[PDB]
Amino acid sequence: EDMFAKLKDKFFNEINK
Amino acid sequence: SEILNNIILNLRYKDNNLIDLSGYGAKVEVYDGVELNDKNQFKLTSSANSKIRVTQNQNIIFNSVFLDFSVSFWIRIPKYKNDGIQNYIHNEYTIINCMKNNSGWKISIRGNRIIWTLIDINGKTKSVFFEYNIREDISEYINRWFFVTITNNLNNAKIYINGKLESNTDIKDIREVIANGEIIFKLDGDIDRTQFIWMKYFSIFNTELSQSNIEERYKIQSYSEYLKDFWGNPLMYNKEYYMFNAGNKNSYIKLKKDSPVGEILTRSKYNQNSKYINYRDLYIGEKFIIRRKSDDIVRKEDYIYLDFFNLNQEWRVYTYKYFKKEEEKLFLAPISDSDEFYNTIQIKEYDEQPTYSCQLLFKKDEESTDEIGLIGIHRFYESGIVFEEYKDYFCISKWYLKEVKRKPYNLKLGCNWQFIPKDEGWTEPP
């Protein structure tokens, strides 16, 4: 379930680049 | 015991009632229209039975040569109604009146001005007042608790606000003033039906208090184990709050569209064309809620979770555990366990002077003494294909860790936050 994981990924991209 | 010398009236809460604890035993009659709470706050409304009557101990002795006394109390005056500016500005109303044989003193209010008036036995009058601005983006006084002290000696009447001298009026002309009559706490004048006033710690002294003595009482009465919200009331768990940043007063937090981060936007302001008033909106941005880690009072050093509401669900504020720069964007997402994010925050109060601001320290573990960083606002480079533009983001920063140690504490640090709950004394209709 937990799309908390998908979000975690949008986060990492937001800070990475 | 410095702030207990020469006290002749000290009204304090006790058993759902107000009582004189001066040691002189004055009689106090609080009528059913007065709201009282155990935080020593009392509310005077427009109802006829919203009043308090104090009958003073007549054996008390006053200075016979000149009027040598002082009055102090905390007050919270509601914001004006946008569609009632004129009456606000012009209608004066008495809030506290102590007259005997047409001589005495009174405290009244006209819009954004607090007024102290003395009438001697010859009928001569003098007043001194304090007026706060009603056009600032963010006011330090409107609908917020503040400390008042009025002192009178042979030569003049002074008004101190939050321990500092603000006004003075020469009264060398005034002769005897009868000051031991009944004290009536009640809104009296052409007031709106919705008008009200909150007061706390009303006290009278038979001496002119010194500036040093006044500043000391300000600090002592401002002291508490708990944190306060933007208006100055106790900060609470499980209560919705908008967030305010002392270092960027016109900024607010908004969840970025399609991204789990908080971007900082600019506060909108009063629209209607009234040259008399101006303010920035307070009820904007995400609605946050503080949860205890483990409705209460949030105390300094407590461990909490800073949550907020995102479309029918309670979300949480996290910090990535391994950001490598000095500061990073906070992660705003659903409540869930993670290996790469910290969620525990310790709420602090680094300022040693009275303040309504607090700080948010992210902790690895409640136990570990390790400090990850403090929550603040930082400008991030959002370099795009075309050209580079910047934008502020709700962040965590390691730089504040050291700055918060500098003394005196810097009130403008971007890690200083205040919580703003909806309050009946502040209305901002579109």
B333–A11 C-beta distance less than 8 A:
yes
Residues 6 or more apart whose Cβ sits within 8 Å of residue B386: none
- A16 → chain B, closest CA residue: B323
Q: Which residue has the tokens 């008036």?
A: B117
Distance in angstroms (rounded) separating the CA atoms of residues B185 and B117: 15
CATH of B230-430, one of 3.50.50.60, 3.40.50.620, 2.80.10.50, 3.30.70.360: 2.80.10.50
Chain centroid offset of residue B211 CA = 21
A2–B333 C-beta distance less than 8 A:
no
Residues in B lying within 8 Å of A, measured between beta carbons: 258-261, 320, 323, 328-329, 331, 333-334, 336, 338, 340-341
All residues of chain B having their beta carbon less than 8 Å from the beta carbon of residue A8 are 331, 333, 338, 340-341
Bridge partner residues of B11 (DSSP): B20
- What is the SS3 assignment for A9? helix
Distance in angstroms (rounded) separating the CA atoms of residues B427 and B272: 14
**Residue B321 corresponds to which tokens in the numbers above?**
């555990």
Distance in angstroms (rounded) separating the CA atoms of residues B114 and B94: 10
> Do residues B244 and B238 lie in contact, with contact meaning Cβ atoms separated by under 8 Å?
no
- Distance from the Cα of A15 to chain B's closest Cα (Å) equals 7
- Residue B85's H or E segment, with its range, is helix B85-90
Bridge partner residues of B263 (DSSP): B254, B393
B334–A8 C-beta distance less than 8 A:
no
Q: Which residue has the tokens 């789990």?
A: B260
Best of A15, A16, A17 to disrupt the B interface (most B CBs within 10 Å) is A15
- The approach used to solve this structure was X-ray
Count other Cβ atoms within 10 Å, centred on residue B319.
Answer: 22
> Do residues B269 and B137 lie in contact, with contact meaning Cβ atoms separated by under 8 Å?
yes
Q: Which of B215, B248, B242 is nearest to B230 (CA)?
A: B242
Distance in angstroms (rounded) separating the CA atoms of residues B268 and B284: 9
- B261 → chain A, closest CA residue: A11
> Do residues B343 and B318 lie in contact, with contact meaning Cβ atoms separated by under 8 Å?
yes
Pairing verdict, β B345-348 and B359-363: antiparallel
Question: In terms of C-beta density within 10 A (0-12 exposed, 13-18 middle, 19 or more buried), how is residue B170 classed?
Answer: exposed
- Distance from the Cα of A12 to chain B's closest Cα (Å) equals 9
Question: In terms of C-beta density within 10 A (0-12 exposed, 13-18 middle, 19 or more buried), how is residue B240 classed?
Answer: middle
- Distance from the Cα of B413 to chain A's closest Cα (Å) equals 24
The DSSP line for B248-291 is: STTEEEEEPTTSSSEEEEEPPB--S--TT---B-SS-SPPEEEE
The sign of the dihedral angle between the CA atoms of B178, B150, B111, B243 is negative
All CATH 2.80.10.50 domain ranges of chain B, comma separated, are 230-430
Distance in angstroms (rounded) separating the CA atoms of residues B174 and B152: 11
> Residue B303 to residues B341, B368, B395, B399, B404: CA-CA distances in angstroms?
16, 13, 19, 21, 19
Chain centroid offset of residue B11 CA = 20
**Residue B222 corresponds to which tokens in the numbers above?**
């401002």
The sign of the dihedral angle between the CA atoms of B71, B40, B75, B35 is negative
> Do residues B379 and B390 lie in contact, with contact meaning Cβ atoms separated by under 8 Å?
yes
A7–B334 C-beta distance less than 8 A:
yes
**Residue B51 corresponds to which tokens in the numbers above?**
């009043």
Q: Which of B244, B365, B359, B228 is nearest to B299 (CA)?
A: B228
The CATH fold assigned to B1-229 is Jelly Rolls (2.60.120)
Distance in angstroms (rounded) separating the CA atoms of residues B172 and B158: 13
Least CB–CB distance from A11: residue in B260, B334, B336: B260
Gap positions in chain B, given as the residue before each gap (C–N > 2.5 A)?
A: 294
All residues of chain A having their beta carbon less than 8 Å from the beta carbon of residue B328 are 15
The sign of the dihedral angle between the CA atoms of B254, B257, B262, B263 is negative
> Do residues B239 and B295 lie in contact, with contact meaning Cβ atoms separated by under 8 Å?
yes
All CATH 2.60.120.200 domain ranges of chain B, comma separated, are 1-229
Q: Which residue has the tokens 């300022």?
A: B351
Distance in angstroms (rounded) separating the CA atoms of residues B126 and B388: 62
Q: Does the annotation place B377 within a ligand binding site? A: yes
Q: Give B87's DSSP letter.
A: H
Contacts of residues A9-15 at CB distance under 8 Å and 24 or more positions apart, as own/partner, are: A10/B258, A10/B259, A10/B260, A11/B259, A11/B260, A11/B261, A11/B320, A11/B329, A11/B331, A11/B333, A14/B259, A14/B260, A14/B261, A14/B329, A15/B320, A15/B323, A15/B328, A15/B329
Q: Does the annotation place B326 within a ligand binding site? A: yes
> Do residues B360 and B301 lie in contact, with contact meaning Cβ atoms separated by under 8 Å?
no
Vertex B231 angle, CA B283 and B353, to 5°: 130
Q: Give B84's DSSP letter.
A: G
Best of A1, A3, A11, A13 to disrupt the B interface (most B CBs within 10 Å) is A11
B260–A10 C-beta distance less than 8 A:
yes
Name the phi and psi angles at B68, rounded to 5: -120, 80
All residues of chain B having their beta carbon less than 8 Å from the beta carbon of residue A3 are 334
Residues 6 or more apart whose Cβ sits within 8 Å of residue B232: B76, B144, B145, B146, B356
Q: Resolution of the deposited coordinates, in angstroms? A: 2.2
> Do residues B162 and B147 lie in contact, with contact meaning Cβ atoms separated by under 8 Å?
yes
A7–B333 C-beta distance less than 8 A:
yes
Q: Give the type of residue at B44.
A: L
Question: In terms of C-beta density within 10 A (0-12 exposed, 13-18 middle, 19 or more buried), how is residue B373 classed?
Answer: buried
- A17 → chain B, closest CA residue: B382
All residues of chain A having their beta carbon less than 8 Å from the beta carbon of residue B338 are 4, 8
**Residue B77 corresponds to which tokens in the numbers above?**
């005056």
- Distance from the Cα of B333 to chain A's closest Cα (Å) equals 7
- A11 → chain B, closest CA residue: B260
Dihedral angle, C-alpha B414, B225, B78, B202, nearest 10 °? -140
